[PDB]
Structure formats: C-alpha cells, structure tokens
Amino acid sequence: MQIFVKTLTGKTITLEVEPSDTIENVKAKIQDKEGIPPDQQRLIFAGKQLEDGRTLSDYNIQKESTLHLVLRLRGG
Amino acid sequence: MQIFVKTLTGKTITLEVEPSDTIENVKAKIQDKEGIPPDQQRLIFAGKQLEDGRTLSDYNIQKESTLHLVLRLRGG
C-alpha cells in the first residue's frame, strides 16, 4: 500500500509499505530514499509519535494514510 | 510504552510513557509514584545524564528500555 509522509516544510513524499512494516523499517526507507539517519527522524500519526518496534498495522495506518516527519537531533 | 527505571539499590520501577514525553515529565511521573521531587532526581541512559527538555525518543529510549535513577540533593 501507499502512504504519504509530510515534512514540516510542507513537502510530501511517498512510500510503498505493508501493514507488517515496523516503524524502524519505515524510518529505514526514509533514510535510503532521503538520506536522513533514523536517529534524526520522528514519525507522527494522528498526533502520536510512533514507536520503532510497533508495526504500521498496530497504528491503524491504511492506504493513503498521511504521516508527519519531524527532524530532530539526538539527545545530548 | 513501558520503560523501566533502575536505582542504585538494584530496585526496578516501571512507568507508562510516550516517546514524546520529556525527561521533565518522567521525573514528575516518578514523583507521582514515589513522592521524590524532580529536583532530587538524576536520570541516566547509556551513561548520559538526560536533559529535562529533551524527549525520550531523542535518546533512543524505546519499548522496555531501562533508565537509571540516581538521587542527589540540590545545589541549590
């Protein structure tokens, strides 16, 4: 299925994923596709930050669901 | 998600947090559970002493991760 990722600049990117994909997998797609390491990605769906070890199906993410990508430096 | 907190006496407590919860909010939760003021709490993950203004996700604190709690009096 196809889901969209919205950035804070208003850009929209697309991914082909499956319900079984974990959030870290989706962050890995964004890394290969856009060059951002997962350490710097935060994914938000329905106002909730998504947990790496859970799947897209755990969050009821369906086809043409829109996630929000937020870029973040890691903790110091 | 569930996190674990380890003290200097080997005791393990647990909390139900969100990836976006700030370290300030985790200390308040420990205050809810143990009555210890946040001022007296130092939270540590991977040897790093965490910053109250960062989120758990900024430190790669995830499902069933174990933080360490050290108690210290304020400066203050």
From Swiss-Prot, chains A, B:
Effect of R72K: No effect on ADP-ribosylation
Site (Essential for function): H68
Phenotypic consequence of K63R: Abolishes HLTF-mediated polyubiquitination of PCNA
Membrane topology term: Peripheral membrane protein
Cross-link (Glycyl lysine isopeptide (Lys-Gly) (interchain with G-Cter in ubiquitin)): K6, K11, K27, K29, K33, K48, K63
Residues with PTM (Microbial infection) ADP-ribosylthreonine: T66
Subcellular location(s) per record: Cytoplasm; Nucleus; Mitochondrion outer membrane
Modification Phosphoserine, positions: S65
Domain Ubiquitin-like, chain residue ranges per copy: 1-76
Site (Interacts with activating enzyme): R54, R72
Effect the entry attributes to changing H68G: Loss of DTX3L-mediated polyubiquitination of histone H3 and H4
Residue positions where ADP-ribosylglycine is found in the record: G76
The record's account of how the chain is modified after translation: Phosphorylated at Ser-65 by PINK1 during mitophagy. Phosphorylated ubiquitin specifically binds and activates parkin (PRKN), triggering mitophagy. Phosphorylation does not affect E1-mediated E2 charging of ubiquitin but affects discharging of E2 enzymes to form polyubiquitin chains. It also affects deubiquitination by deubiquitinase enzymes such as USP30. Mono-ADP-ribosylated at the C-terminus by PARP9, a component of the PPAR9-DTX3L complex. ADP-ribosylation requires processing by E1 and E2 enzymes and prevents ubiquitin conjugation to substrates such as histones.
Cross-link (Glycyl lysine isopeptide (Gly-Lys) (interchain with K-? in acceptor proteins)): G76
Phenotype when changing S65D: Phosphomimetic mutant that binds and activates PRKN
Effect of R74G: No effect on ADP-ribosylation
Function statement: Exists either covalently attached to another protein, or free (unanchored). When covalently bound, it is conjugated to target proteins via an isopeptide bond either as a monomer (monoubiquitin), a polymer linked via different Lys residues of the ubiquitin (polyubiquitin chains) or a linear polymer linked via the initiator Met of the ubiquitin (linear polyubiquitin chains).
Name of the protein in its database record: Ubiquitin
Organism: Homo sapiens
